[PDB]
Each structure stands twice: as C-alpha cells, then as structure tokens.
Amino acid sequence: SLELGAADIQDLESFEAGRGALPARAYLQSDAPRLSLNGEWQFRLSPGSRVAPDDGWQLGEALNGFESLPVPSSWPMHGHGAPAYTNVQFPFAVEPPHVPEANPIGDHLVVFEAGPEFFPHALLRFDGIESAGTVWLNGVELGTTRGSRLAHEFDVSGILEQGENTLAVRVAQFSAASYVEDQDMWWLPGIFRDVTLQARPAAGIDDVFVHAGYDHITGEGILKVEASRGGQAIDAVVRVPELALELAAGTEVRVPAVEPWSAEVPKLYEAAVSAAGESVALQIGFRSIAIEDAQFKVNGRRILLRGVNRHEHHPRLGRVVPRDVVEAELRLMKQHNINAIRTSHYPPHPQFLALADQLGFYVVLECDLETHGFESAGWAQNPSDDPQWEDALVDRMRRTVERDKNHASVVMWSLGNQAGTGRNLAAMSRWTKDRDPSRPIHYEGDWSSEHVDVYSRMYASQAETALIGQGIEPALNDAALDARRRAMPFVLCEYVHAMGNGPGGMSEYQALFEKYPRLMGGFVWEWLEHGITVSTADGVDHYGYGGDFGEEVHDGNFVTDGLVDADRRPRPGLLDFKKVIEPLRIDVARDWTGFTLRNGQDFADTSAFSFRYEVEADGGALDGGTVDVAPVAPQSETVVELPGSVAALAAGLSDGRPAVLTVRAVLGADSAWADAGHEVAWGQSVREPGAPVPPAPVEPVQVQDSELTLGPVVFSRATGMPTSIGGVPVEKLGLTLWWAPTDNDLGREWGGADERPLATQWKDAGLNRLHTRLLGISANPGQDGGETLTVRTRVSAADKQYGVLVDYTWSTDGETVGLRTQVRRDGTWVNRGFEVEWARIGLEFVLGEETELVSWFGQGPHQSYPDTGQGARAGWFSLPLAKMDVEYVRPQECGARSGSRSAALQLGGRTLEICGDPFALTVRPYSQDVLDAAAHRPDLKADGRTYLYVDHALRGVGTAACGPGVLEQYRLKPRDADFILTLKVRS
Amino acid sequence: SLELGAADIQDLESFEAGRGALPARAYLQSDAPRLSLNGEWQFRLSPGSRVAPDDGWQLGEALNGFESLPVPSSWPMHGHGAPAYTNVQFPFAVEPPHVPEANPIGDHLVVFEAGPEFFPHALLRFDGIESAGTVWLNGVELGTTRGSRLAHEFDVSGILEQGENTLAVRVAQFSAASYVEDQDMWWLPGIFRDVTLQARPAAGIDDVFVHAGYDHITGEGILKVEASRGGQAIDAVVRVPELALELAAGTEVRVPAVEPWSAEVPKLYEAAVSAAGESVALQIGFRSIAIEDAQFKVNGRRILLRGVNRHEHHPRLGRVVPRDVVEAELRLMKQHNINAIRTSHYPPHPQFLALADQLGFYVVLECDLETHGFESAGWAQNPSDDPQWEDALVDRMRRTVERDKNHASVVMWSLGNQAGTGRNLAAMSRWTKDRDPSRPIHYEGDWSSEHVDVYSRMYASQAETALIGQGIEPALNDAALDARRRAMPFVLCEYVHAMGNGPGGMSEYQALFEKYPRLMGGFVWEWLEHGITVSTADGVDHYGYGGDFGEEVHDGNFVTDGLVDADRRPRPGLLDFKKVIEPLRIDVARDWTGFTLRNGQDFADTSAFSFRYEVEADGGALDGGTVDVAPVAPQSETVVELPGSVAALAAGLSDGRPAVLTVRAVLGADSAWADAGHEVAWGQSVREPGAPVPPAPVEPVQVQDSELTLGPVVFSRATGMPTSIGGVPVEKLGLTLWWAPTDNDLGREWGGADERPLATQWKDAGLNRLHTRLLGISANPGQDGGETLTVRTRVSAADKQYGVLVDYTWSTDGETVGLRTQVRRDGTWVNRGFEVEWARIGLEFVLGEETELVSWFGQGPHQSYPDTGQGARAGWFSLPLAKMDVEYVRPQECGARSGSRSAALQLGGRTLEICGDPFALTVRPYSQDVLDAAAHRPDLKADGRTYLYVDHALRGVGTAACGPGVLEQYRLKPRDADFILTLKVRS
Ligand SMILES: OC[C@H]1O[C@@H](O)[C@H](O)[C@@H](O)[C@H]1O
Ligand SMILES: OC[C@H]1O[C@@H](O)[C@H](O)[C@@H](O)[C@H]1O
Ligand SMILES: OC[C@H]1O[C@@H](O)[C@H](O)[C@@H](O)[C@H]1O
Ligand SMILES: OC[C@H]1O[C@@H](O)[C@H](O)[C@@H](O)[C@H]1O
Ligand SMILES: OC[C@H]1O[C@@H](O)[C@H](O)[C@@H](O)[C@H]1O
Ligand SMILES: OC[C@H]1O[C@@H](O)[C@H](O)[C@@H](O)[C@H]1O
Ligand code: NA
Ligand code: NA
C-alpha cells in the first residue's frame, strides 16, 4: 500500500463523532479563570491530505510555510483559497464517507502562556471548527472534532505546562461530516469561533440544567436548578436575590409570584449557583410551553410567531459575526416587529442565546444536520437512515441540546433541515424528548410528523395553509398518524422567500395566521443576503455571489435571498414585512372622527405606546398631536375618538383636494431595542385627489415639412413620437409590456403544463424585443379652432403574428397636454401553445436630459408592486434620482412606485409634471436592456438620458424563485385597455 | 394624413409582382449590341422610407450623401449596414404585407453613354435586386422589380438618349416580397447581379424555346426550336452544323443519330437561330426525362442522383459569386463525385446553367419562394394559400421557367421550399405543366404530392427511406392520392445535414439508394458554409456567423452547415461523401489475387479510367503498376486478376507484419473538370498488424519518499499518476468519457421522452466536469523479481452517486511499458430519469511538452469517427500537429483518427510511441475545456502542453442538428471495459 496520506484520510472518512472530548455540557458563565486564545495565529494551507506535511510543525519547528492568520476566522475570507457557494448540490462526488482529493487542509498554531491558576486542572474549548479538527497540545494529540457549529472541550490536565505552551490544530475543509452539513450557504473552512482555556478548580460545577416553569393559573414559578460535576449531582446553593430565594440545587420549589418571560416582556431574574470552588451566573426566565387543542401556547396563551431564519454571515469575515453586528442586527429585527428566530440550520454562536433571552425572541434552536444533496438520488445512501451514522447524529443533537438548554428564549428544538426521513432522526428525537421534555420538537423533513410535536412545512401555498388552518387538509394514509398530526399546531419554518424584488403575497399568509388558532405563524426565508464584498478591476466594491469565486458548481445568486443585505441594510421587503406583521391594527374612520384599535399582542397591553395623529396636505402638516388611549388588553379592541380639529379639517377641505390622516403607535419611552418615538404600527385615511381634467383642445396642429407642433409639443412626422414637450427633449415614446426579470421571474412555476420561468416565457414570446410600426398620423377637429392629433401604431415582435394596436390622442390648451392611450389586442397572445402574460401596460418616455429629483403623490417612500408595498404609506415624497433605485446584488426590475396620482421630474431648469388615475412611476438613468443584462451593480451605467415609466397596469412579483408565484388576483393577462394622462412643463 | 413616406410604403406593401417590365423570356446569347453597366456607381443609404430623401437625386443633383459602391453588390458587404442571419424566424413582425419602420433604403445612381447602336430600340436588364427596386432613366420611372433572384427587363425606347444617360435605382431591403423570401441564409439587400443595356434590332428574336428529346430505342434526337418576337412566332432559321441540319424554327424533326446528354457524358451541339436582324447562339443537349414504374429515368435509364444543395454565397462579396469561383467550385464538386445540384432555394446566376450543361450535372432548378416563418403560427396567413398572392407567386414561377427552359441540365422544376401547402402552389404547378411538360415538377412541402411528379422529403430517416424504397410506407388517407404517390419515385431533396463534425450515417442511406429502384438518391444539405470573413481586434481573420453582426434575432452558426467552407476548402465530410457516392465499387480479394469491379454509372462504361494498384509496407511501396480492364458496362460487374507479384508479396509477408494493397480507378486522361490521374474510386485489402505484446514484468517498483519508479516510468505517490515516461513529462493521466459537443450534440433528438440535446444531457450529468479519487496504489509480484503496479481510482462528478472504478496496471521490462486499464461501473448511470450516454471510453495524457509531428498506422489522413471516415483509407500517415485539427467555424470535437493501431508523437528530441488494439488517436495543443468554451477559432490558444487522447471506444457523430441522431449501432451506452496499450520512448 504505497499512496501517501492514507491514515489522515481514514480519519476524515470516519463515521464516528470524533474522539477524546469531554462530555457535552452547557455553555456557562463561571468565575473560574478563563483565557481567550483568540488573536494572531500562524497558518499553513495544503491542497489535500496526501501532500499536507508531517514535518513536526505541531511543535513550532516548521515556521516556513506559515503566515499570520486571525483566529477565529473563515480562512477563505483572508486570501487562502476561495469561498464556494452551493445550494443543494454537493461540491464533491457523492460517495459517503469518502472525501475528494482536492481538500484544503489548514494547519494552525499558536504559542501562549498559562499561569498557575490553570493548574492542576484545565480544559481547552473550541466553539466551532469547519469541518474536521485534530488538536495537539505540546505535541500530544488531544483528539478530534466533528459537528462544525458545535462545541468541543478537551482536558489538558497533565499536558498543559506552566509558562509557554504550543497549540496546534489541523483543520480539513471536507470530511465525512460534510455529507451531513449541506446547508444552502457558503462552504467556509476554519476555526471560526472562540478558542478558550478554562481552569477547572476542585469542588467546581461542570454542568447546570435550569428548569423554570410558569403556572398561569396561580402566577407561580416552578424552579429546579440541577448541578453536576464529573457526571454526578452535587450539593450547590442557588440564590435568586430578586425573588428572595436561597435553595439547594436539585430541589423543585414553587415561587409565589413571578413575572413570566415572553418575547414581548422578556423578564429575567439574575441567579447564581455556587459550590465551594466555583460559581455560575445565570439569567432565569420563567415560562412554560404547552401544545393543547392544536395550538402552540406559552404561559397559557396561544402566540403568533413573526419570524425570520437567521444564518451567521458577515460579508468580509464569513461565519465570524462580530458581537456588535449581532447586537445591532437583533435590534434591527425588533425595530421591524420580528419576535421569533429560527437558527437556520445549526446552533448559533453560544453568546447569541443570552441576547435572545434579553431582547426577547422566541427561538427555534436547530441542530447542525442537513443532507439535502441526497434528495437528487431518491435519498439513496442518506445518512439519516443509515445505521453507520447513528452515533454521529445523536452526538450532534446531544451537543446542540446540552449547550443551550438553560435559555428561556429556546421554545423548540429542531432536529435539522432537509435531511429526509430515517431511523437516526427518530433516535435524535427520542433522545431529546427523554433529556428535555420541556420543549416541543420540530422537524419539517418527515411530513407524517411521527416523531415531532408540531406540524412544520416550508413554502406551503397560502391556499394549502388555509386548509391546514381549518383542519381540513387531506388525511395521512395511517389513521393514527393522521389523528396525531391533525391535532398539532402548524408552523411555516420557511415562507415568503425574500429573494430580490419581493416577497409578494405576504398579506394573504398573515390574514390566515391571525384568523386560525392552529396556525402558529411563520419564519421568512431569510433574514440576510450572504453577499461577499469584492471589488472590480477599478476598485468598485460590490457584493459577489455563487460563481464569482471560480466555482465549478454553484447556485449563483440564490445565496442573496434576504430581507437585508449582508451589511444589514434593509431591502424593501423588510419594510413591507414590518407592516404586514405589525402587532397593533389601526383602522382610521373615513370621516376622520376616530380609529379602531386592535391589540394583536399576546401578553402586553398598549400602555407602552404613544398614539399620535397627523393631517398633511400639499402645503405640509395642517394639524397633529397625541391622543390618550386607555390600555387595551391583548387580543382586544376599542374605538378611539380623535380630537375634533381633525374632523373639522376633513369637513372644511374642498372636495378633490388631497389630504392624508395618519395615526401612529410609537414607543412612549426608550426600550432595550429602540428609542422613544420608534414607530411600531400605523393606519391612514386618504382623501384622494380628483381624476385629471384633460385640457380643452383649443390649440391647432401646425404642420411643418418634417415636424408637427401642437401647443408645447413637437412631433416627428417620420415616427409620430414627440421630440420635445415644453422644451424637454424626448428621444422616444412607446408602449411597454415587459420588465427586466426579477429573481422570482427566473423561477419555475410548478403546476400546469407550462413550467418555463416567466422570464423564459417572455424571451420566447419576444416580449423583451418589441418593435413599433407607424400606421398613420391624423388631426381631428377639437374646440374653437383647435385640433387633436391621433398617432396610430402597432406593437409586436419579430417573427410573431400577435400585436397590440396602440392609438395616442394628444390635445392641448397651450399649457397642459392631454394624452389618451388606447390599447387593443390584434390576434391572440399565445406562443408555444401557452398564453403570454404581460409585466405591465405602460409607457416609456426616454428624455434627452438627466433627472435630478423625483417627487410624487402616492405611496412611499420605497417601491411598491401590486402584491407588495404594504409598508409604503400614502403621502407626498421627493427623492434624488439615485435613491429611487434599489441596490439588489443582481440588478433587476425594481423601484416602481405604484398607486401614484401625480409626479414631477426636475430635469435641469424645467419640471415635467404628470397626472393620472392611479399609475406606477419608475425613473432610471439607464435603459431596461442595461438593467436586464447587468449581473452585478457596476454593470449599470448612466447614459445621460432619463427613462420614465408610467404604468396603467402592473403585475405582482410573487415568490416564484422558491414557493408560490404571483397569486391570480395580481397576474396581468393580455387585455384591451385605455387610460388618460395629463402633462405640464414648468420653467 | 400627416406621416411621411406613405406612398413609398404603399408600394412596398403591394401584393403585385411589380410593374412596367417586359414579358419574361429566356436568357439568350445574341449578337445584338450589349453594354454592361456593372462598375462603380454612387450610393446613398437611408434607414427607412419615411426619411429616404425625395431630393431629385434621380437626375444626379444631390451628390452629397452619395459615395462610390461597386455594382453588382450586396451592400452590407461593403460597410453599409450589416449582414443579418435568420434561419426560419422572420427578422420583422409577421403581419403581411406590412414592412417594419427600420428598412434600409439604398439609392443607386450611374451615368453612362449609349451609342447609336442602341437606337431606336433598347432595354435595360436587371438579373437580381434584393428585394424591391424602383428604376428611373433620365428621370422617367420605368417600373419596379419583385422576385429578388429573378430577372427583369424594361423598354427604354424613347427614354434612352444618345450620349449621356442617368440611371437611378431605389432598392428597399424589406418589402411584401420578404414574406415569400425566407430562405435559411443571410438577409443581404442590393443590386447583386448584372445590369445590362441591350439593343433590340428590328426583325430580331426575343425568345427561344428549345425542345431536344432523345429516343433511346432508335438513337434519334427529336428537335423543335421555337422562336418569337413580341409574343408572336417568327420565321427563323436553325442551323446545327455538327448534325448537318438546317431547319425552320417551329418545326419538329427527327435527327437520325445523336449522342445523348447526361451528367456523365454532357454532349452538347452548337446551334444558331437566325432572323434577319438578330442571331442567337445555343448549346443543345438531347435528353428525355420519364417517370415510369416508380422510377425517374433519363434517356430510358434509371439514374442515381449524387447531389448537393448549392446556395450562392461568397465570404467577402455576399450574394455576388465571381465567375472564377463558380467554375472552380463546380470542378471541385465533380472532383468529389457529385453529379447533381439543387439550386437552393432560388434561381442561380443566369450564366450558371451553361456551366452545368457543359460540366455535367442533373439540376433541380428551384423557384424563389419560401414562407417557412409562417409555420410557427400554424401557417396562418401563409402567402401560398392566400388569394391576394396568386399573381405574385405565378409570376415567380413564370420568370423562373422562362429564363432557364432551354438548358439540358435542368431535369426538374421545383416550386420553392418550405412554403407549406396552398392554392397558389397548385396554380404554379398547373402553369408549369402547361408551359413545359418536358420536365417533372418537384415540391416537398405537400407530402400528399397531389401537384407534383416525384415524392420528395427532407431528412427522412434511413429507416423510413428503406420503407419507401420497398413501397411499403403508410398510406395516405385518400386512396387515389396514395396510389399516385406510391407509384412515384422518391428523392431526398435535403439529407445528411453537414453541419460541423459529420455528417454521420451517410453509408446507410447510400446502400438503400443503390438497392432500391424507386430511390432516386439525395442532395446533401448543403454544399457550402455561409461564413463571412471578419477580423478580431488584433487583425486575426476568421469566419463569422449569426449574431456576430449585432442581430437582435438570429440563428447562430446554423448558416455554417456545409461540406466546404465559404472559401471552398473541403471539410472532412466532403472527403467522406466522395467515397460514399463513388460510382465504381472495387472489392479487393483477401488473398490479393484480384478484385471485383462494379460499374455503378448509368450510361458510361469504365474506359475513361486507368486501374492502378499499390502495395505498401512500413518501409514504403513494395510494388505497384496498372492493370488492363476490359470496359465494364453500366450496372455490370467483373472480376479482374492482379499481377502475380502482388499475391507473391502477400504470401511472402510474415504473419503479423502490416501491409496495405490499394486498387484505384483514376482518370486516364484530362477531363473538363480534373486532370489525368485524378482518383475517382478505390478499394483496399489490409493485412493487419498483430495485437500488442505487453512486456515481461521483470523490473521491480522502486519506492522513494514521494515517488515510485518502474523502469522508465516515474509516478507520484500522492496521485498515482505518472509524472514522466522515458523523460517525457506527464502533467496528468486520467479517464475520459466526454468530448466538447459537436453541432449535432447541440441538437435535440426528437422522439422518446428525453429531448434534451446530448450536450445538455452531458452537462446535467456532470460528464463535462469529472473528478478522480485515488483509492490505493499497490505493487504485485511480476516475473523474475519484477513487479507490476496497480493504481486504483474512481471517476465521478460533483453531486452524483454514479461512478466508474478505474484500475491501471503498469508493467515494464525497462524499455517497453504495458498499461492495462479496467473500467467498471459503480452504480447506475442515470440522471434526471434517463440513461447517460458516453462520448468515449478513453485516456487523456497531458504532456508537459509540445508535439511537433504526429504519425500513425490506421486510417487517414483526415479524421474518422465510427459513423464517418469512409474517405479515410488504411495506411501510414504523418502530419504536423497543426494539420491534425479541423478548422470548423465554431470549434468543437474533431480530429480523432479512429482505427489506429500505432502512433508516434515527436516531442522535441524524444518520440513517444503507443500501440494498441484499434484505438482512436487525437492530439491537440489546448484542452477540451478550451475547445468547448471557444465560439470562434481565435478563442483557441496553445498552452505549451500536448493533450493526447487514446480512445478504446467512441460514439458516432450522427446528424442530430437537423435529422437523424447517431444510429443505434454507433451509440455508446455505459458499459464495463478493459483494454491494453504498450508505450515506448525513443531518444
Ligand atoms: O466567536 C468568535 C467571535 O466572537 C464574537 O463575539 C466577537 O465579537 C468576534 O470578534 C469573534 O471573536
Ligand atoms: O433613529 C435611527 C434608528 O435608531 C433607533 O434607535 C430608532 O429607535 C429607530 O426608530 C431608528 O430610527
Ligand atoms: O418609428 C420609430 C421606430 O424606429 C425603429 O427603428 C424601431 O425598430 C421601431 O420599433 C420604432 O421605435
Ligand atoms: O452577376 C454579376 C457577377 O457576375 C459574375 O459572372 C462576375 O464574375 C462577377 O464579377 C459579377 O459581375
Ligand atoms: O492536383 C490538384 C487538384 O487539381 C485537379 O486538377 C486534379 O485533377 C485534382 O485531383 C486535384 O488533385
Ligand atoms: O489526484 C489528482 C486529482 O487532483 C484533484 O485536484 C482533482 O480534483 C481530481 O480530479 C484529480 O485529478
Ligand atoms: Na439584470
Ligand atoms: Na466550442
């Protein structure tokens, strides 16, 4: 046997959960001496095990080949190799437990000093190594690590020396464990969480298990704090000063009056558990979880989960998320009405849990297990059902549960994600139910729900969710399993996939969640885009995605699918989500005399809020103030009268003049997660402006050799299009039916005979390449010598027989211009046997000047499409042109402002004003073809023109990249249509 | 009505066949004064009719805007606009008769002088204008032209002036006629054929209709020459000196003994038809065409059509083909055994016909009509069935027939191509049968064959062709039409689509053509690639195809689909086609005592040929000479004994020594189309070399720290691959299963549930991204202390569970190296529910040095794949590395030499020699990934290495880009396999 590296590879191919580590336990704050070994280490990278040197480097001998590297790190974020993104597909041949030859091996070394406080006993702790570590101290092998996002501790007693010590860690990127770590995220090897030396004094405390329940009938807490050392229960004293408690560890007591913990009111009691040689500090939240009457209840009440799936990602550091970024992102979540987090799909940094306890989130704490890449082979060889993997998978669940079991915020344990079904998942569930019956078990992969306590799905349609909400879904074949599942509450562990422009359809889910007790709510996929900061050859920073790092196989921009970008800047979807899930409902009366207020919270009343009103008109705010609202109980409602000055204004306003009344609930005082005045909920009542009044057509058409003039409009006799309006140059005017496909439009809409993505349907139909033929131009008699001008055109595409006849009728009184557009289908819009849907029915004006500022009356400030824009409120808005865009990583259709009634574009020294019945407004400095072709933001370039889109109709954006497409009510099928606009130019 | 250009556009949208032209007539060589107006004209281009100036330019006033342009020309070939390629799809919206707004309008002007010989009567002739011309002379509008490849003449009597004249022609690229001119070719506007002034003397001859039949029973000619002036029969004298004839025009006579015309023996008789004021010169070929007993017969005998489809294209001049290029390409066709031409899909230059008469080709002369782009809408609005188009389509057929009716080479009239079915095609057929019953009518678009005389198909499979050949195809529903069609002879007007590497499957068609009298033969699609010469930014010339000229819609490289490149350089397909269709069959006896000879000609005996033999061995020619063969009658065979010295050599050769006997039929004397010694047919008998003798394994394996040595081979202990063989550096050795997709592999194979192109099947299966895992390396006991080395590997792809186990066993005696490769499937090669076919089972050696010369024993000199290579004969070959490649316009798999038994690569100062049972040999200076990624030849770059492919199995190439894919016998399904090679390095 002559090949090199055989012993290293046999270890990497092991089915065992590693070796040599101390038993799994909780992460505990203790007074035992602690030394962090994080800092600058030495690092050497080899391309695989067979060439990784065996040169005594573990002693500090072979310094050459090594260079400085920060630890913790994801090493490809620091110039060593490259990140690689795959969604489902494995990046290596699927033949478990074997590893590919190209397998980056990273050797890490650090020298540190240990004082006498670390003797006689100490351990070394590793909070995360992706994916396989072998650890040596002073040349002695301590053992190995498996379970990339799980903690391992090694006893160093008798190996650690007083004074200098040399720690060496060989990390393999790929191992047998990679087959059970196939999450949809970047593959990033490294020692990516804390490395800590901890003294283990005699008569200490190794593990603690807090049991802190709440009896909602009596208001009592139920407390038992177990404590152990070396696997044996120990005498220890538990002190909870705020509750006047001093009790023995291991005894259950009833605490007469506790304030219970919830995400809404995250009450924590400081406690200490003390033995002779060590004391542990705890924060105890009293809460009990129950499943009863097909409802998920906390402290005796059904709750509504307004959730996100949170991965750990940083655009420059990879899987290392600095604490300040964590704290800020959790506050950002609370600022957007989120109350729940799923740790997709592995345990988070150990210090995350205390922050969730403190700020208040219901947490689904998920084990590091995902075998999704076996699905393509019908789950053949799936680790979850293979006996050889049982110990490894039970170990993952054990380490997951033991680490985080003391945290009130953890309300459910999840077995993993997309791991199929099998005997080892059942073993993990059995182990967990025996160890910790206080928390229900979650796992979506087995729809029969045989081994879980809630029924979980991902991306079930709104329609199917309504059936489940009513308890009327189709039955499982096994009547006993059906009876069990039908009596379970239902959660969407992933829904409304938030990739690109979207997600559409959030309101339809939310109405169901709020109506049906069996529906627990849902967790958006996902909180963040995993963009990675890169730069062009000219130094322009932007986010990269799959394939931008030379990957042979990858899934492109499916890793940029979040509510916020990788720097935690909100996408429009987050602003809409905040509104959709707002925990108070404010319904303002049409007559402005008051509002109905529903408190949708589960535990808190409305006393935390200040209720403010404001009336705005074109000239600015006409009135505003606060109203005193007697606190409304959870799940109750009331009617609140507004001050008489508000209704007096409504009465006084001349009909047709626009005005907006907004009632908002803001924090009355600072909280831990936002300042006083932070807006939580709002409602409005709008007095809409009258429809536009087209001008009397009293100006005649003047005929020149090559142009026509009609008041302030000049037209080409060769094209029929305006070439200037009030001196604003017009390069082109034409009909639009298409937009640059969103990420959702690039997804297949399964079901029905046509499974092409909408983008492909449009391409095949030629909708991305429309052309216009001029049929004729004629003047018609107007008023008092004036005339109208009708330009007749037909729009179609090369090689197609279908078209739309489009007639433009122009009129003017010399100041205002009227434009009537009439669209009539000429032939059936069917291509390849299927109907061709449209993106819009609108006009594109290409103006020969740049726009500095865009103002409008409608909704805003951010974009809105028919099935989004919940967060866009009625009002007057004004933005610099650059701020109208949306910085999606892959540029795509975005930035439309639906529901507009008037718009004004400042183009140098002139203002172009447009009025209509509701229209969508978009303004860009580059064309739709530039937007479509661009794969990253630096591909966009301004060309000196203004591209102005006025849409009479728009389709929705849906979630077709993963889950439901556009719901029927928001689809735009071909139709005939007519609409009027008025235009004016002010100088 | 205020738009510009309305009158011009109404004319362009006219359904009429133009206006003002003289009646259609023959192209006739006459003694009337003729002046060619070809030369340097003045030219101005506008983007459409609405902006095309009406500035009096027709008089020579508006010189500015005009620049010099050669006429004839295709104007986009001279920097004015750009060529655009579409196959089927129209490049404009389909709404006949309307034209798009973007419609290049080219104004052409020339001043010329006319002497007194052009008075009182003269005409102007235009032999082609694409697509719509309006003609003025001295400011007077003569009329308009429709039918782009048809001739028009205009009377200029009373308009032409003695002295200076100004001719003006406005040409529109697009018109209503574009809807009936949708051939698969470049769209190229221009005045692209001759412009001629012709005097029309009094008492002259306007038209002549030659009728020249042949009675094969008596050997007599049947002659009648009709002559007319102004539509009336005239007295004229017909003189045929070689036949001693002086007769009146309009009288039918029997000529006692004529030598008949055929493509094989194109006998022409010079004749003159003379009236008082004009004489016409003719070449008369006597031949009669008959359909009888379901056979197409000429001069009483069934013929076999060995044909090509000939478009008119030049890579720098467009639709203008210089006469010297025409003459050379026709000789090239004859040099490759072609005897028939289809003028796809329009009449050729008028002077082509005399060349076909003279050189000898059976011509299918096809009308300028193709409406293929209406098929996508179910033929809705198809001009062929629309009454408004009747006059226009009958006019096209009339002009087609009248121009060329006097030519013996025209044996069938074709109505057009891919024009669907309809009443106007029936009208065209009726008109033609009435006007010229001497020629059968062809049209493939109506499979019922109701209005034609032969049954024509395009790309019918070999299987379906065999059924038709036997008269057993499924019946038409109408019993009367079925009886008619079943009694028709059958032609493939297009078959064996010759795009890229291919066409495969030619032999299977040819065997049927030769076996079944009803099968007339076939015309390859197509003679030439329509490449257009372009240059890179660095000045590297190459051919461009669709999309290389900025087209919005195009069909890519489907215009480069020929047997020769646009400069008439043969592709390998032409060399194979020549052999497939060779008109003599030479079957050499295994014992080298003689050969059987079949004369497959229809009229000629074998007296034109010299029969030569040659015996070659490794050292060179051992013997050769000529053998006297008594002339063999058409369709007969004989046995010919070879000189005894040949068999004496065979007897004397030691068994296992290779030797090749080749018998060839060459021209004994110069012909009009090739020189004496030109090879027409050949056959061989091969004494094959013995199988390779692997060495005695008497050298042991020497183990070093990181390498192993086994005689002259060094191996890496990290990869198991050789790193040098005899000092030749080896960068990589591995198994191959894939090749860079050919044009055929990018085509869909219709039928069955899987219609992905093979290239897509491979991509989805990961066959283009295989990786290898090392399982182990071990030494085994050899002989007398020696050892063998077995390297065990597994080949698979990321995210797939299927693989192949590949074991390499190495042995050496210190000079020769033995390599045994064993391949075993591990799991089923099924992906997306369908079996994954392989391109090959072979080895790729990547050598770290450049190869200067490649030599081999096998077949050659050109490439061969399992279903091609008919033209590659057995022998010894040697080529510089560059000449091993094939210069396809889109680079793709090519250059394999199948059937090799030994190869030698000269790499600097060393020669690497390889021996095996039959293997395919390929050698390249760039990798397969470079070949696949390259879209044009300058994308290929040498990297300083040698890529050597040794294939134990290869799949065929088929014709799946259009028509049959690889036939079952040539497909390569996954299998287990083993094979032996020997290697030696000589310094
Ligand atoms: O777990 C390791 C990480 O822990 C975070 O809390 C810290 O802010 C980061 O800098 C890094 O050290
Ligand atoms: O003010 C900036 C941000 O800071 C928070 O503290 C505040 O409460 C939020 O509403 C947000 O506006
Ligand atoms: O009359 C203006 C027209 O210009 C053409 O160049 C274009 O193809 C048409 O779609 C239309 O825009
Ligand atoms: O028909 C026009 C063409 O005719 C060819 O015979 C000639 O060689 C070309 O130069 C061009 O004049
Ligand atoms: O010799 C060059 C070429 O020229 C032809 O005249 C000859 O007959 C052909 O066989 C070809 O070889
Ligand atoms: O042992 C050599 C190997 O090297 C790796 O880098 C490659 O992925 C494998 O396919 C194989 O070539
Ligand atoms: Na884009
Ligand atoms: Na290629």
Residue numbers in the entry:
A (entry chain A), B (entry chain A): 24 to 1010
Question: What's written in the study?
Answer:
Psychrophilic β-d-galactosidase from Arthrobacter sp. 32cB is an interesting candidate for industrial use, as it can hydrolyze lactose at rate comparable to mesophilic βDG from Kluyveromyces lactis. Furthermore, it exhibits additional transglycosylation activity, it catalyzes synthesis of GOS and HOS, for example: lactulose and alkyl glycosides. The functional dimer of ArthβDG has two independent active sites. Each of them is located on the top of TIM-barrel Domain 3 and is constituted of residues from both subunits of the dimer.
The role of residue E441 was previously proven: a loss-of-function mutant E441Q was designed, a biochemical activity assay was performed, and the protein was crystallized. The introduction of point mutation E441Q did not disrupt the structure of protein, yet no catalytic activity was exhibited anymore. Determining the crystal structure of ArthβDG_E441Q/gal complex at atomic resolution, 1.5 Å, resulted in discovering six galactose binding sites at the surface of the protein. Five of these (G2–G6) have a potential to bind larger galactosides, e.g., lactose. The analysis of atomic resolution ArthβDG_E441Q/gal complex revealed that galactose binding site G1 is a possible allosteric site of enzyme. The G1 site is located in the cleft formed at the junction of tree domains: Domain 2, 3, and 4. It is highly selective toward galactose molecules as residues N360, I361, and K357, constituting its bottom, shape it in such a way that binding of galactosyl moiety is highly preferred. The correct conformation of hydroxyl groups O2, O3, O4, and O6 is necessary for monosaccharide molecule to enter and bind within G1 site. Its limited size prevents basically any molecule larger than galactose from entering. Single-point mutations of residues E441 and E517 introduced in the enzyme’s active site were not sufficient to change spatial arrangement of galactosyl moiety bound in the deep binding mode but were enough to abolish the enzyme’s activity.
